[PDB]
Every structure is written in C-alpha cells, then in structure tokens.
Amino acid sequence: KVGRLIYTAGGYFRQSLSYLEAYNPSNGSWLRLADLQVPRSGLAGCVVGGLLYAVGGRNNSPDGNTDSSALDCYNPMTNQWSPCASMSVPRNRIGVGVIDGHIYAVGGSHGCIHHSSVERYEPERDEWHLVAPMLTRRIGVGVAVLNRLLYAVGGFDGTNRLNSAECYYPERNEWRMITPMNTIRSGAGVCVLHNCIYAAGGYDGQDQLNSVERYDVETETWTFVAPMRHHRSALGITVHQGKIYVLGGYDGHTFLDSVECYDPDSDTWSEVTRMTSGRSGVGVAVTMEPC
Ligand SMILES: O=C(O)C[C@H](c1ccc2c(c1)OCO2)c1ccc2ccc(OCC(=O)NC3CCCCC3)cc2c1
Numbered sequence: 001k002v003g004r005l006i007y008t009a010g011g012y013f014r015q016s017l018s019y020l021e022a023y024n025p026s027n028g029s030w031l032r033l034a035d036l037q038v039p040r041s042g043l044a045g046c047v048v049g050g051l052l053y054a055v056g057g058r059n060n061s062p063d064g065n066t067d068s069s070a071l072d073c074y075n076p077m078t079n080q081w082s083p084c085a086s087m088s089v090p091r092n093r094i095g096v097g098v099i100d101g102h103i104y105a106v107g108g109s110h111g112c113i114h115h116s117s118v119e120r121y122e123p124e125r126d127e128w129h130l131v132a133p134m135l136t137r138r139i140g141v142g143v144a145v146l147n148r149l150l151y152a153v154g155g156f157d158g159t160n161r162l163n164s165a166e167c168y169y170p171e172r173n174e175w176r177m178i179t180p181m182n183t184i185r186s187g188a189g190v191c192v193l194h195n196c197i198y199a200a201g202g203y204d205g206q207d208q209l210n211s212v213e214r215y216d217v218e219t220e221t222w223t224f225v226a227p228m229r230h231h232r233s234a235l236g237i238t239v240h241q242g243k244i245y246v247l248g249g250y251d252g253h254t255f256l257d258s259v260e261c262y263d264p265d266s267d268t269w270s271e272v273t274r275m276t277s278g279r280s281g282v283g284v285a286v287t288m289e290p291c
C-alpha cells in the first residue's frame with residue numbers, strides 16, 4: 001500500500017498540455033516527470049500491472065486540433081513513455097475503465113462524430129478489439145468499474161447533455177441502462193468508492209456543478225453527498241486510500257489548480273493541495289512512485 005502517487009497526465013490551459021506530474025498525499029510533494037510524447041487533453045488515465053496508460057484525447061494547438069487514437073504507457077521504474085497499439089478510432093473526451101487487467105475505452109468524439117463504440121485492450125497481446133457499443137452516444141462520459149461491471153455515466157450525445165447512465169456486463173457483452181442520475185452531467189469526474197459509483201461536478205448545459213451524487217449498485221438509487229467547495233467540469237478524479245481526489249477542471253471563470261479530497265466517513269470535502277498550474281481535461285491514475 002505504501003509509496004503510491006496520484007499521477008496527472010496532460011490537460012488543457014490555452015492549449016493541450018504534455019505535463020506528467022505526480023502528487024504524494026503522504027508528504028504534500030509534487031514531482032514533474034517525463035512529458036507525454038504528444039500534448040493531449042480530453043484523455044483518460046489508468047493503471048495495469050504498475051504501468052500508467054494515457055488513452056485518447058486531442059492535441060489542441062495554435063496549428064489545429066488532432067483527435068487521438070493513441071495508447072501510451074509510462075513506466076515509473078524508467079521515467080519513460082512508450083507507444084502501445086492504437087485504438088480503432090480517435091476518441092477525445094473519452095472515458096476508461098479497467099476490468100481484470102483489460103482497458104476499456106468508451107465513447108468520446110472524433111470531430112463532429114459522437115461515439116457509442118467501445119473497445120478493449122489486452123496488454124499481454126498489445127491488441128485492441130471492439131466490444132458491444134453503448135446504447136447511447138456519449139462524449140465527456142465518466143467511466144468507472146465496480147465488481148467487474150463497467151459503468152458509463154452522463155456525457156453529451158451531440159444534441160443533449162445527459163443524466164442517463166448504463167452498465168456493461170462483460171460475460172454477456174451487453175449494455176443495459178441503469179437508473180439515471182438526478183442531475184445532467186457532461187464532463188463529471190466518475191469513480192468508484194466502496195459500493196457506489198460517484199459522479200462529481202460536470203456541466204449541465206447551463207452551469208458548472210459542485211454537486212456530487214453516488215449510485216449504490218445494490219439499491220439502484222442515486223443519492224447526493226456533500227458538494228465540492230468548487231464548481232468544476234472536465235475535472236480529473238481518482239480514489240486513493242478510501243478517499244476521492246478531484247483535480248483541476250473549469251469553474252466557468254478559472255482553470256482550477258485546486259485538489260479536493262472527499263472523506264466518506266465524515267461526508268466532507270477538504271482542499272489538500274494545488275497543482276503546479278490550473279488546467280482542465282487531465283487524465284489521472286494511481287501507481288507506485290518513480291525512480
Ligand atoms: O458538454 C459538452 O459540450 C462537453 C463538455 C464541456 C464541459 C464544460 C464546458 C463546456 C463543455 O463548455 C462550457 O464549459 C466536456 C466534457 C468533458 C471534457 C473532458 C475533457 C476535456 O478536455 C479539454 C478541456 O479541458 N477543454 C476545456 C475547454 C474550455 C472549457 C472547459 C473545458 C473537455 C471536456 C469537455
């Protein structure tokens with residue numbers, strides 16, 4: 001359990017960013033690590049076998065926008081990124097989840113296309129394959145895995161921002177709708193903590209949100225918990241040692257540098273650190289500290 005850092009990859013402030021920075025909750029420190037090979041925002045992060053993966057996104061630059069089909073792998077033992085097999089299609093504003101060592105890439109956009117497609121990466125074989133598509137096209141979708149079931153929450157289908165959510169049952173290669181959230185959320189942070197799927201923040205079509213709700217996978221209800229201190233959309237999120245961390249995002253005025261931490265025992269959020277600069281659209285995951 002000891003020695004794990006919260007890694008934040010990529011993001012957006014004025015343009016897409018190549019930063020990889022890692023926060024140590026035990027001592028408050030931040031480390032700047034090897035930049036991504038290509039600046040990306042709208043990507044997702046995940047970890048399999050101790051390696052950090054950066055999935056999808058877009059490179060917004062002064063010279064244009066390129067949606068990414070890339071999968072790149074960062075090894076903390078070498079502080080180096082290596083390319084992996086690319087996805088079938090570019091996916092900006094993607095959601096990712098891991099089931100039993102396999103990476104699922106969910107939804108996202110490619111230009112004006114809003115994907116319902118989903119694909120699964122096998123690290124052993126360095127191969128992607130498509131699986132059943134979602135019932136809804138979703139970009140800016142939040143994804144989390146609980147009990148080897150994969151949840152896709154919220155997003156934007158091209159016309160409407162969504163309160164709907166759905167679950168993927170791998171042994172049946174099938175998606176089914178779940179109870180919709182109480183709030184429309186595009187670009188929420190979505191994670192798992194204990195027996196619930198949390199959706200924090202997002203954009204409802206009108207305002208950036210500070211509200212947070214959680215789906216109990218047994219009772220099939222969504223319940224609001226304490227709101228974050230800051231409204232935020234396009235935030236990074238992860239869970240570490242039984243607490244949710246939210247990183248950055250956009251509040252309607254500022255690209256936030258704040259990191260807040262949710263304690264489920266007290267049902268409270270606290271501000272724990274600040275990133276080195278404000279940014280939105282980051283990928284976040286937890287793995288061992290580097291060499
Ligand atoms: O619902 C929609 O149309 C899409 C939605 C969105 C959210 C909030 C919004 C907004 C649009 O326009 C008003 O504010 C969204 C959802 C998830 C995202 C995940 C990553 C991401 O990476 C790039 C990035 O960070 N971009 C900045 C640009 C400047 C404003 C904030 C995001 C962008 C995302 C956008």
Ligand SMILES: [Cl-]
Binds near residue numbers: 042058060092
């Ligand atoms: Cl974008």
Ligand SMILES: [Cl-]
Binds near residue numbers: 046047285
């Ligand atoms: Cl992960």
